[PDB]
Amino acid sequence: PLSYPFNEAVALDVDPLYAKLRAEEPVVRVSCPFGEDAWLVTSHADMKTILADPRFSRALAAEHDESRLTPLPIHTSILGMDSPDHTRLRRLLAKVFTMRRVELLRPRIEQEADRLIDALIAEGPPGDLMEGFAVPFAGTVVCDLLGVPFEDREQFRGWLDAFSATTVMTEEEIEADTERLHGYIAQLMVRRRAEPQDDLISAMVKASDEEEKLSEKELVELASVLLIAGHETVSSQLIDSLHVLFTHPEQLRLLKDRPELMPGTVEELMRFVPLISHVTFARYATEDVELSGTLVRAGESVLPAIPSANRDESVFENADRFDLTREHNPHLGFGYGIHRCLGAPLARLEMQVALDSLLRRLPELRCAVPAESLEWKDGMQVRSLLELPVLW
Numbered sequence: 001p002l003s004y005p006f007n008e009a010v011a012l013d014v015d016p017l018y019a020k021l022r023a024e025e026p027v028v029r030v031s032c033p034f035g036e037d038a039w040l041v042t043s044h045a046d047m048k049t050i051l052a053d054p055r056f057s058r059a060l061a062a063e064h065d066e067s068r069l070t071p072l073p074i075h076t077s078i079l080g081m082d083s084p085d086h087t088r089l090r091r092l093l094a095k096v097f098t099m100r101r102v103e104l105l106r107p108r109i110e111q112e113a114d115r116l117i118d119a120l121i122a123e124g125p126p127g128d129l130m131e132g133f134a135v136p137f138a139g140t141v142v143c144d145l146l147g148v149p150f151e152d153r154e155q156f157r158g159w160l161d162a163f164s165a166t167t168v169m170t171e172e173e174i175e176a177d178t179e180r181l182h183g184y185i186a187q188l189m190v191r192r193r194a195e196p197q198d199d200l201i202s203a204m205v206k207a208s209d210e211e212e213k214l215s216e217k218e219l220v221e222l223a224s225v226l227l228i229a230g231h232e233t234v235s236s237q238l239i240d241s242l243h244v245l246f247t248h249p250e251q252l253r254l255l256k257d258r259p260e261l262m263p264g265t266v267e268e269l270m271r272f273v274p275l276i277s278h279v280t281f282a283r284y285a286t287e288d289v290e291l292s293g294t295l296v297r298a299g300e301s302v303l304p305a306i307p308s309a310n311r312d313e314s315v316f317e318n319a320d321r322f323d324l325t326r327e328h329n330p331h332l333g334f335g336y337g338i339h340r341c342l343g344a345p346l347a348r349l350e351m352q353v354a355l356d357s358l359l360r361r362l363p364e365l366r367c368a369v370p371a372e373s374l375e376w377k378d379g380m381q382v383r384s385l386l387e388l389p390v391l392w
């Protein structure tokens with residue numbers, strides 16, 4: 001079977017093999033960097049099936065040497081569970097991670113974007129939209145929400161890569177950093193149990209201790225993935241989105257003159273940005289399933305190449321084109337079905353506030369270097385810039 005990934009992900013370029021696979025062989029057998037061989041799934045319709053059809057399981061992966069790009073299986077907490085365990089954690093989170101809580105964060109989120117832009121301006125151009133905006137914006141928001149002290153970022157931020165690194169960390173470094181993060185969250189939970197604050201960890205501990213009993217370890221592992229999602233996924237998506245906007249200056253001009261397009265713009269960025277470097281987490285078939293002419297037998301794994309589903313020309317017209325006016329946008333950038341992104345309302349809020357504020361306050365914002373000089377973060381499960389120098 002083809003060794004997969006076929007090629008290292010470069011900048012935001014999509015490997016042209018996905019288009020060929022989608023056209024000529026949408027499901028193909030591959031060998032993975034780690035774990036068992038798998039079926040690479042490339043089309044939008046098959047993506048929905050393996051993500052939402054109950055014939056495909058995440059919890060089954062623990063009964064295998066899970067097909068994966070990471071040296072060790074990731075502690076994916078809720079995202080590694082099936083019903084009923086999944087239902088138990090999803091209910092817990094939905095009860096404390098309410099829409100009211102999110103919209104109550106809006107003024108704090110807006111204020112953080114304005115404060116970050118005040119700093120960029122006071123420091124003068126060129127500024128770095130990654131370490132000077134996307135990272136601390138995403139970080140302060142998730143830290144505010146979760147109850148992780150943003151002041152501890154110096155400690156915990158260097159452990160987060162352990163949850164995402166493919167080629168650039170050893171088993172031993174991943175295991176050590178995973179233990180460091182879990183143990184840091186566990187100490188936080190002791191404080192938050194005794195001294196609850198208005199944050200998710202306190203609410204989760206209270207709800208778990210009182211009704212929806214979770215083990216300490218389950219609580220730790222769930223708070224940990226919430227930290228990763230808010231800190232890393234959000235800042236990665238945001239900085240990649242700014243890159244897309246800078247490299248499509250015509251759409252950036254359109255957005256600035258019709259701000260009511262921002263909701264559809266965020267959705268189009270979710271679709272178009274190939275944020276996931278290759279695939280999200282493998283599922284395993286519990287029964288035989290045919291996908292685009294390929295029989296996937298029970299016990300075999302499928303790799304969901306979500307970014308390729310989001311370039312499916314049979315679902316999105318001119319799927320290879322970034323078009324922030326796109327109206328039909330059933331993208332899978334926030335997943336689909338049972339494991340669809342619980343944080344999507346918040347991520348959409350953050351995206352909209354960040355882009356609106358930047359475009360509002362920095363009218364002539366533009367990249368300070370040619371796209372060729374940019375340094376990307378390689379060897380992770382998502383794509384991101386290390387620096388995005390800008391003028392204004």
Ligand code: HEM
Pocket residue numbers: 051078079080090225226229230233234237238275280281306332333334335336338339340341342343344346347
């Ligand atoms: C732009 C930012 C984000 C993107 C692109 C994103 C994307 C995704 C995707 C694609 C999935 C499904 C993965 C799969 O099926 O293998 C997912 C699941 C999930 N995401 Fe998000 N996410 C983002 C931000 C967030 C935030 C801010 C949170 C929480 C504060 C969050 C929490 C979760 C959780 C808990 C799950 C698993 C839910 C379950 O298994 O039931 N994400 N996310």
Ligand SMILES: CC(C)[C@H](O)C(=O)N[C@H](CO)Cc1c[nH]c2ccccc12
Pocket residue numbers: 074075076077079163164225226228229233276279280281381382
């Ligand atoms: C979830 C997809 C966008 C993709 O698999 C990804 O970024 N995984 C990272 C790195 O392994 C881990 C992660 C990010 N949010 C999560 C939410 C729940 C569990 C794990 C994660």
